[PDB]
Design a protein around this ligand. Sequence first.
Ligand code: HEM
Ligand code: FES
Lengths: 106, 401
Amino acid sequence: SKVVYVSHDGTRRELDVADGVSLMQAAVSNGIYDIVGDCGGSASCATCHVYVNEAFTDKVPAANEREIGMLECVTAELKPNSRLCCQIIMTPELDGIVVDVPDRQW
Amino acid sequence: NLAPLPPHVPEHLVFDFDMYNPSNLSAGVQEAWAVLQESNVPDLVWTRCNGGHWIATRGQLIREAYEDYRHFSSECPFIPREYDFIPTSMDPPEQRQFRALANQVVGMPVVDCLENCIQELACSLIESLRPQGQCNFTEDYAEPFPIRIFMLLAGLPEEDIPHLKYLTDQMTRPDGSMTFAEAKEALYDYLIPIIEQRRQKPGTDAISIVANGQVNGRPITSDEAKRMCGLLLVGGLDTVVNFLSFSMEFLAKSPEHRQELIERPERIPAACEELLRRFSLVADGRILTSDYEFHGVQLKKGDQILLPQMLSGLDERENAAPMHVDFSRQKVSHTTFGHGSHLCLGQHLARREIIVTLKEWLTRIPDFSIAPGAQIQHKSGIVSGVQALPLVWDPATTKAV
Ligand code: HEM
Ligand code: FES
């Protein structure tokens, strides 16, 4: 399924991501370096922050309490559509999802 | 020797495993540790060895404990309770400062950038060995590879390798001249002038980047840079040396598995993950910051708990037939690089080292075995390992690319 990652400076990237792969893992394995993924995907760092495009927010499963807790530590602006993309698991349902990558992770 | 049982510890939870000297170490390291996972052993045990400490035996508990630094602190990560390096002993939020700086030097962008250099290093080593029909892999490849990677990243000359090998070996596989503290002081004595030189005149090498970096909004101190650089060296050595050795030990004994990868080199990345799970090798832990009930066991403030990274992937609850190597496993579940906010900073670099090693070795020396008469000796501890790995091959079955 397609996932589009748009950087803060407007750089666009698109990946074909397998079912079951997180949007962090895909970004980190394919040169989308403005997502760091420091903790390896356990909602333990805040360096996989993205802004989920408003056309897709009701297709994406809700954040759990651990993610909500960690989202309080993001360094970029925290917005209503902020997510930790290691918590977003690719499914055919999410084909075409656009995420905007913030201007900082550290 | 057995520390007296604290009275808060239930007698029926006592299992006196000694992580430095486990029984049946001749069956293999991971086999020796997997005694903790037999069906009658509880999920959480106390050993009276090494001062007395808890051990979590199952992946589910290991992961949960690593996700809760509020109760399970890194302030005292090693058993026994009696080493500074940064950021091993720091919890968030302060630990995050040093993760950010370390990522500038061993992060995925640097690892992607270095891939061709790493392949060239591996090929040069392997081509030097190929015609000889033998090597001690541990010394001839497993150590020179990652140390040469470090010298490359850190902008350090080739002529310093022997000295750094010697000191790092005294730190981790001590021949017994130097204490750990002496060896560490000597490593610091080598780094200090280099750090001072690269603060006065920076380059673009990893020591320049760490040593001119920021933490907490101010320039890093020379002493913080030294402690970070020491870990970036020792952290990628002990683990890689021993892990590569475990893997090649296994491939030397396993012709069908070797053949899978010779015929289908596209399966190497998957194989690397499956070897990471089967031959996992680290066991550190955490200290209780307060009294806390965990999985029906009352833990006391100050108690240490071993949370052995090794064990999570060997847990039959996490992977069926866990002692079997199956490169086609649908989900390889493990915590070999750790879990939570301290998950190995080197995890990307380590995977590329393993993948490049397997691809470049098998293409040149496809068929090899353990030297006749050898019995491979293992050690157990914080990083478990292989003392030496004598391999042999027929040079007529090899190929120079
Ligand atoms: C097979 C190879 C490796 C394994 C199995 C491994 C395993 C681990 C484990 C389990 C930890 C976490 C320990 C804990 O939570 O207390 C760790 C931390 C670390 N590793 Fe590795 N490691 C490997 C390779 C590397 C390499 C190549 C480097 C290179 C720089 C490296 C640098 C570090 C650093 C700097 C830390 C500290 C992270 C922190 O405390 O925030 N490791 N490693
Ligand atoms: S990778 Fe650490 S919270 Fe997502």
